[PDB]
Amino acid sequence: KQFHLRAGKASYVMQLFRSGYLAHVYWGKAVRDVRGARAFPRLDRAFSPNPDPSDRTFSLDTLLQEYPAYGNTDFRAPAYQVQLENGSTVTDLRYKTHRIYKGKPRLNGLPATYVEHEQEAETLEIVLGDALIGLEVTLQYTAYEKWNVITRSARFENKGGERLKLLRALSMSVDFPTADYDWIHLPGAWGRERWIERRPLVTGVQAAESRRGASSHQQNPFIALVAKNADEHQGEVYGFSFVYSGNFLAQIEVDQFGTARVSMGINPFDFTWLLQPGESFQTPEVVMVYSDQGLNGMSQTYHELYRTRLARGAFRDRERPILINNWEATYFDFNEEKIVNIARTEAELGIELVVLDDGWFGERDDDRRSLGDWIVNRRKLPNGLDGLAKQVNELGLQFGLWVEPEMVSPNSELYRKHPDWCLHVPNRPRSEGRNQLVLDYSREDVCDYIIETISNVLASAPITYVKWDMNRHMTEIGSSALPPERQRETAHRYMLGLYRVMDEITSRFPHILFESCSGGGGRFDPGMLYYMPQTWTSNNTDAVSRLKIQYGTSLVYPISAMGAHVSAVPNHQVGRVASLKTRGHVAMSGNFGYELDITKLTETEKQMMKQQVAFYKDVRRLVQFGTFYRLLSPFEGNEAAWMFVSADRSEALVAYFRVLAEANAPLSYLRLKGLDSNQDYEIEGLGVYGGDELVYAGVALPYRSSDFISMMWRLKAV
Amino acid sequence: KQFHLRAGKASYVMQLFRSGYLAHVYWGKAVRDVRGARAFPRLDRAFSPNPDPSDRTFSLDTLLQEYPAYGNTDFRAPAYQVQLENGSTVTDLRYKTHRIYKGKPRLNGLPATYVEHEQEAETLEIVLGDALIGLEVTLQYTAYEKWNVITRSARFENKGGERLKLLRALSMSVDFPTADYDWIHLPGAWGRERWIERRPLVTGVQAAESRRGASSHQQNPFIALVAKNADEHQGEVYGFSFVYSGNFLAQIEVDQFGTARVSMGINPFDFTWLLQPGESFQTPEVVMVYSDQGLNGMSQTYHELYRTRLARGAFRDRERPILINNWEATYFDFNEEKIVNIARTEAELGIELVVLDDGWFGERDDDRRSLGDWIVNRRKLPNGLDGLAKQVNELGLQFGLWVEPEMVSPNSELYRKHPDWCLHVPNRPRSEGRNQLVLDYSREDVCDYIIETISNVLASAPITYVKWDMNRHMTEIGSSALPPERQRETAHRYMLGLYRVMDEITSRFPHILFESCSGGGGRFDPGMLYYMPQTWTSNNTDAVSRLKIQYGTSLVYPISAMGAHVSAVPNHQVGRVASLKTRGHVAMSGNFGYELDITKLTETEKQMMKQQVAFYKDVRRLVQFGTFYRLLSPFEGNEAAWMFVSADRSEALVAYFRVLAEANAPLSYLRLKGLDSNQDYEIEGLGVYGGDELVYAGVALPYRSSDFISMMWRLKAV
Amino acid sequence: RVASLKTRGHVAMSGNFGYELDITKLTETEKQMMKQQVAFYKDVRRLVQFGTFYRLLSPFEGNEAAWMFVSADRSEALVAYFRVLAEANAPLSYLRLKGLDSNQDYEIEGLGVYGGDELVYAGVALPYRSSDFISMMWRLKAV
Amino acid sequence: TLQYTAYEKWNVITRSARFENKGGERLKLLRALSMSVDFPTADYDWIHLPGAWGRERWIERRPLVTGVQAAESRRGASSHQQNPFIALVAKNADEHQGEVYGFSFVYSGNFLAQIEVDQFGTARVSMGINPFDFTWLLQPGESFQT
Ligand SMILES: OC[C@H]1O[C@H](OC[C@H]2O[C@H](O[C@]3(CO)O[C@H](CO)[C@@H](O)[C@@H]3O)[C@H](O)[C@@H](O)[C@@H]2O)[C@H](O)[C@@H](O)[C@H]1O
């Protein structure tokens, strides 16, 4: 009774064990069969108790599992926990049945990777049941044909007659037979998101998580098990990505016998879910990638999958517009005239989109006001949004708009009309982040209001781009529309609310390109990517700081979603002064755009901008849709390097960066990846090199002085 | 508004911040005053919300705290969590008052370090309160005078009108300003407890814990923060020791701004506690030790504190008897005359105590019955316990007894009479560990029964030693005597019951030496030490295996409590053969005893055994009550070495071990510690050497082949 | 050091095999093992002395050592594993292989048929054993 | 005369040197290594085989230092103490993957196996007869084969 999923060139094997226990067998490089699945030593481990008195070699404490519970002989951390009306927490899921079918189901009220044709994937659903309490859990497995991807999630259902309180409901859990690995997660903060941290495993618990109601800048919902010797170019890697934008827990526990349990899902902390008879609960999915091609092999799988089978809309496969954003340029101090007058210059430079950022609404002259009042400031924009958008359109420029619809200012019309529409708890002070509060997206009336309000704004002007921002994390989490026993469900219901709001709004406007934002990359997760196919990577726009942030972000997320802007110097976040050329090379390594005051630019700088725009337009398709290879890590030394390669490996773009200059420095050489050994490539300006020479020997690098230098080479097969 | 605790050579500083918030300031080497406590950048951190909207530079997400809560601006893991009747989990403790007095309070129904006189320590009680709900929390701080010891614990009291659910109640929490450390915990398993593991911190969460209802073989309730360069002999070390024998969480969280939060206490997992209006909850204490003299300096503080101010009873300061366990010589199948016959020759060898092991009661002919039926088996012991003991006494030997009162066999009179007296949950199969169930010590009827039954046994014979064992961990945790809303209090109430049972039984028999046991060192924790002055370290008695186990155990626990017995070869646990010489040396480096069939011993082996007993009596006071220094780590190489030094540094005993033999090996040397460099030392049978030479230069170790060797030097000042 | 005869043979059979000890001092049960050791080595001598050699586990990096010999056509192989110091209640052991044909199945003498990919990519579960200085050897033949 | 041989089926390059005095003066060879090669970079570990009697050829992996590292013999024999073999390996290279550069000396007497990293991060690997306590006179017409 063995289950065997074939994902790309990887195998995921499970089997039934004894009285309907579901056991994990193997996840790794594709094997035709796992014949030794039951041929392992059966031991009576001291202090591992027994559910079956007739066989003391069997314990749940020593069985590799797919969805373990605590209480009936397993002492490791459970993937789920349920409290009964009697107060006990013992549950006992046994195999009930299963089904296999081509394709991939939609998950209720949630984002998920999808397929366009049934042949793209295969789905396995294993239904488990606890007969005593009527609890049924359907474990969902999906294997893509094309990629080494296994997606996992679980669906709880109360088919009994009692109330069932879910204390914990993780999406997945898997017991590795050994624990000789390092783990990688992506810790950070505002202005420095997703730094790569590699650590050895400990005997105990290690976890990245979020209790912020948002996936957060502080810890990104991604962990990975990597072989001790694995790097960017080789070695076994096991990726775990969470398709959800709220609270999460990503945990690895190593037990007394050297087994490693990796579990991921909605953070159990401050979380409960009540299941009345007949009610169900669907967890978000976790996308699991195996690679033996090292970190690049893993990332390249995530890039393709997320770009073509998670991101949606009309712009999913379209090249993204080069934009100018006015936030760093003017902040709140702007008007219609200053924007329209500079637009002519912007069009001349080759810019394709003008984005009006924060401050266009209500009395938004600072960050302490008017959130929730999405009416145009007639003083700042006399002709309104429609006037500005049309003026901008006439110059051959698209018009974009910034919104932050999940928020409400205490000093606003909306809050004076509906003070109870925010997240709060009875009789407690309402803490503020950036002088704002969070709207209760768990309430339907609030969600209905937002959908209608924002739709009116988006329909009042020829807007073809929206920047959906969110600049605060939840405190005093609660809702006045939920009973006491469902209060702990507030944070998740909020996220379900937001997903529904975004789904409806984005579907009402198929011609709009939505970019998600959260004070930078505070919600750069797969869940948001499903609703908005690109993201503002970070508020830190410094070329050097962006080396780490973009390198780290590229670990999971496709370049097409990674927004990057050239900003002014001295940089507004760190004060660093880098040349325009270097700033361009870093921004052109992502979703290229601008964010600076053009009226303060010299003719030389404006002329360099025009050439930057022309160049990026020439390599845009390659950058945003080509294959990405990381070459030199800014976390390991003084250099950063990467390259983009087309599908047929005929064209390539190479980018190199050295931050700190060293006097009388050694000669440097860059080796490339992903090129065809049997072909020659003309490096633009250098000469014809062999594909093998560029990969096995590398190219000598020009000796250069000064800090923060950059170099780009266009490669073309000959 | 600065609190300054002064413990030995250490300082612990706190201050009131703004509107009655309690902030952490400093914990380290003693300073007269911390004048820069408020002189730090008051920064506005992005996404760190403000309890006061007017001031963006204040946030609980960025305040170093003493007892942090979640929900009102802090996003790090909290020290405590309370759920209200309205479903919310938001609380807000503010400073109310504080009291300072000489001495140290006893904790209600719990073990704790103590004082014999007021002047030994100073206690600070900070009273916090959430006026909205009438929740009063008293933070208890005690600072010893002669030791760098700070003890912390919290006492909850509901002075409100509504009921409150503690979802989490840790004993302490502390935020270090920086996080550039490693951490040390003691993972393990049965037969290999408390191995030392040193790991670098991760930006995120690390933890050691136990969900087994017992402190466990798998993770000892102890963690430490150590400086990156700290070793056994030098460097800053911060130790955390939990005085509790049930479930625990020992966690270190590192946040976005390089802060490290260390928190410890009863495991929040599967735990709640209901506070009706007027009810209290006292947490166990955590003992916090600082040292700048490496891991030895930390351990030596723990050893002295725990041996003289935690352990209790008539045997606290008394030398512990060399005992023999005749278990492996007969197993269950023994009788009165078989015991008295071998006891005669054991008295000839110099043994002082004979321990009658499992099988003496009910129908214990195997490990499958009779647990709970604590009456003398008249088939095996026709003259009862009193008959056997008095025969043992008239040989000059003490009589000891083995019991396991926390357990009940399904096949027993007790279970047939009271099947509901075990830990269980309705309608669920009662899982067994080693063919037995666990008695529900959360109930008073069970506790009162055990107390009386065990007392009758201990009073029926001249028994001066009791080995209290427990060979199974809790499953299906629940109580038929508890209402559904208190079910999750079962495990903790179990431990409170066991603490009360042990307390009353040990009180009734002051002339008895109690040794706690749990399949080896399954509860080798400070809580048990309070009730029983010594503990059986491990069921693995193999000399080489014992090196790591004893090295690790000594990190927190004194040698006086660390049982070590000589056993037969080939070893029953690993199958290793090591000579009796080294088996003796390993065991003499702890609380010495024997566990082997003497009838199967050769005349050579019986000769050496006589010398070992004679030798240990000479060095017993030094080993059991001297200062302990670790010299070579079995976790770091092929060797192991440690030494005992008297308080006046006039005597010392050195032990050295080498595991694998190396052909044509380099000459080895061993540097000592703890000696007075001004004096010269007589090494018996070797010569006189200066203390400086022994410490700064070292002793040349004799070249020797064959595996698993050992050496012992006796040192005496001139 | 006192190691078993099986262990010593397994180590010596991983090189140019021979003997250097006093046969007159050996027991009868020991002599019968020598006969088997000599016989066994002859069966695999060509493979051992002329096959392709792969190191799997380093004794410089831990408590284990393991290597294997593979025929030039990858149809025959021989695997040796060694653990030095035993530990009580030890975790389960697994050994991955190298140099096998992935597209073929192999029959391990004493165990059964296993896929070549399975042995190399998943590995094989090792028997739980106590006592110091242990060794195991397995002949592999493609089906 | 620098001698290079490249095998067809194996990744093997062999190197040796042949001296010859065609002039009219005496020539004393103070040093005559078999080969020497300059790597463009020095980001490698190095492996050599140190040992003793009863424990020959233990594997030792070390990072490179900026300066001189060497395994050698002055015993008139290749010796137990150091085997005439060194290797440059990539930092992440192991038994099953990664770039490795082996250097094996076909000689049974004294040897010098040296790696030298200079100020510009290049790594000079040189091997041959140990120059220590070694000279060789070449009269006009005489030759020397390494
Ligand atoms: O409002 C437009 C702006 O909003 C988003 O980001 C704003 C970002 O800025 C703040 O960071 C700072 C740093 O301390 O915080 C203070 C005030 O809170 C500001 O002076 C300063 O900028 C906020 O704290 C963050 O909450 C917030 O993320 C968006 O990312 C921007 O692109 C832009 O649209």
- Number of CB atoms found within 10 A of residue B316's CB: 13
Return d(Cα D137, Cα D30) in angstroms, integer: 9
Distance CA(A606)–CA(A612), nearest Å, equals 10
Distance of CA B66 to the CA centre of its chain: 25
Give the DSSP letter string of A476-507: S---TTS-GGGGGGHHHHHHHHHHHHHHHHHH
Contact B623, B588 (CB under 8 A): yes
Phi and psi torsions of D59, nearest 5°:
-80, 125
**Which residue owns the Cα nearest ligand 1 atom 33?**
A327
Terminal-residue alpha carbon distance, chain D: 11
Q: The tokens 């700088």 sit on which residue?
A: A605
Q: Is the minimum distance from the CB of A327 to ligand 1 under 6 angstroms?
A: yes
Is C58 in contact with D96 (Cβ distance < 8 A)? no
| Binding positions of D | 53
E strand or H helix that includes residue A687: strand A687-690
- SS3 string, B8-26, reads CCEEEEEEEECCCEEEEEE
Task: Say how many Å lie between the CA of residue A519 and the centre of ligand 1.
Answer: 6
Tokens of C83: 């653990």
Rounded CA separation A645/A622 (Å): 7
Resolution (A): 2.6
CB-CB contact of B224 with B208 (8 Å): no
Asked if B428 and A471 come within 8 Å (Cβ–Cβ), the reply is no
Burial of A712 (0-12, 13-18, 19+ CB in 10 A): middle
User: How far does residue A543's CA lie from ligand 1's centre (Å)?
Assistant: 19
Are D95 and C58 a contacting pair at CB < 8 A?
yes
Residue B634's Cβ-side half-sphere holds a number of Cα atoms within 13 Å equal to 25
Chain C residues touching residue D95 (CB < 8 angstroms): 54-56, 58
| Inter-chain residue contact B662 with D55, CB threshold 8 Å | yes
Rg value, chain B, Cα? 27
Which CATH number does the domain A301-623 belong to among 3.90.1150.10, 3.20.20.70, 3.40.190.10, 3.30.70.520? 3.20.20.70
Give the separation between CA B613 and CA B324, rounded to whole angstroms. 11
Asked: is C49-143 a CATH 2.60.40.1180 domain? The reply is: yes
Is the Cβ of C2 closer than 8 Å to some Cβ of chain B?
Answer: yes
Q: What is the DSSP string of B301-343?
A: HHHHHHHHHTS-STTSSSPPP-EEE-STTTTT---HHHHHHHH
d(CA B404, CA D4): 80
Q: Residue B194's closest CA among B708, B467, B554? A: B554
Ligand 1 atom with minimal separation from the A434 CA: 18
SS3 A604: helix
Q: Which residues of D touch C54 (CB under 8 A)?
A: 95
Q: Is D68 on the interface with B (CB under 8 A)?
A: no
Identify the closest residue of chain C to A29 by CA–CA distance: C121
**Diameter of chain A by CA atoms?**
86
Neighbours of A467 (CB within 10 A): 25
CB contact under 8 Å between D120 and A667, yes or no, is yes
**Structural contact between residues A613 and A349, judged by C-beta atoms closer than 8 angstroms:** yes
Give the chain B residue whose CA is nearest to the CA of A192.
B256
Q: Measure the CA–CA gap between B147 and B289, rounded to whole angstroms.
A: 8
The secondary structure element, H or E, covering residue B296 is helix B294-309
Residue recorded with tokens 């000689």: D107
Q: Return the ligand 1 atom nearest residue A367 CA.
A: 1
Residues A181 and A235: their CA atoms lie apart, in Å, by 11
- The answer to whether residues B3 and B66 touch, using CB atoms and an 8 Å cutoff, is no
> Which of helix, strand or coil describes residue A610?
helix
A252 bridge partner residues? A206, A262
Determine if ligand 1 sits within 6 Å of the CB of residue A357.
yes
Separation of alpha carbons B523 and B503, rounded Å: 16
Which A residues in the span 436-495 are in contact with D, Cβ-Cβ below 8 Å? Answer: none
Closest ligand 1 atom to A517 CA: 30
From the number of C-beta atoms within 10 Å of its C-beta (0-12, 13-18, 19+), residue A1 rates as exposed
Closest to B481 (Cα-Cα) out of B495, B498, B499, B493:
B493
Residues in A touching B257 (Cβ below 8 Å): 189
Which DSSP category does A594 fall into?
A: E
| Experimental approach taken | X-ray
Contacting subunits of A (3+ beta carbon pairs below 8 A): B, C, D
Verify whether the Cβ–Cβ distance D95 to C60 is below 8 Å.
Answer: no
Q: Which CATH number fits domain A1-300: 3.40.50.2300, 2.70.98.60, 1.20.1540.10, 3.50.50.60?
A: 2.70.98.60
Ligand 1 near A434 CB (within 6 A): yes
Residue A50: both structure tokens together = 């027994």
- Out of 2.60.40.1180, 3.90.180.10, 1.10.1040.10, 3.40.718.10, the CATH code matching B624-718 is 2.60.40.1180
Residue A553, C-beta contacts closer than 8 angstroms, at least 6 positions apart = A193, A194, A521, A524, A537, A562
Q: Is A358 in the pocket of ligand 1 (CB under 6 A)?
A: yes
d(CA B659, CA C86): 12
In the residue annotation, B525 being an active-site residue is answered as yes
C interface mutation test: which of A13, A15, A31, A229 has the most C CBs within 10 A? A31
Q: Write down the domain spans for chain A.
A: 1-300, 301-623, 624-718
Nearest residue by C-alpha to atom 10 in ligand 1: B46
Asked about A504 being catalytic, the answer comes back as no
Structure tokens at A618: 């020439």
Subunits adjacent to chain B (3 or more Cβ pairs under 8 Å): A, C, D
Smallest Cα–Cα separation from A12: which of A23, A20, B314, A21? A23
CB contact under 8 A, A669 and D41: yes
- Cα of C98 to nearest chain B Cα, Å: 30
Distance CA C38, CA C13 (A): 9
Q: Kindly provide the b/e burial profile for residues B628-665, where b requires at least 16 CB atoms within 10 angstroms of the residue's own CB.
A: bbbbbbbeeeebbbbbbbbeebebbbbbbbbbeeeeee
List the single residue in A88, A212, A519 with the smallest CB-CB distance to B426. A88
Q: Which string of b and e fits A334-361 if b means at least 16 CB within 10 Å?
A: bbbebbbebbebbbebbbbbbbbbbbbb
Give the C-alpha distances (Å, rounded to integers) separating B672 from A138, B303, B654, B684, B702.
63, 20, 8, 16, 16
Residues with Cβ within 8 Å of residue B526, at least 6 apart in sequence: B111, B113, B221, B241, B242, B243, B244, B287, B306, B310, B556
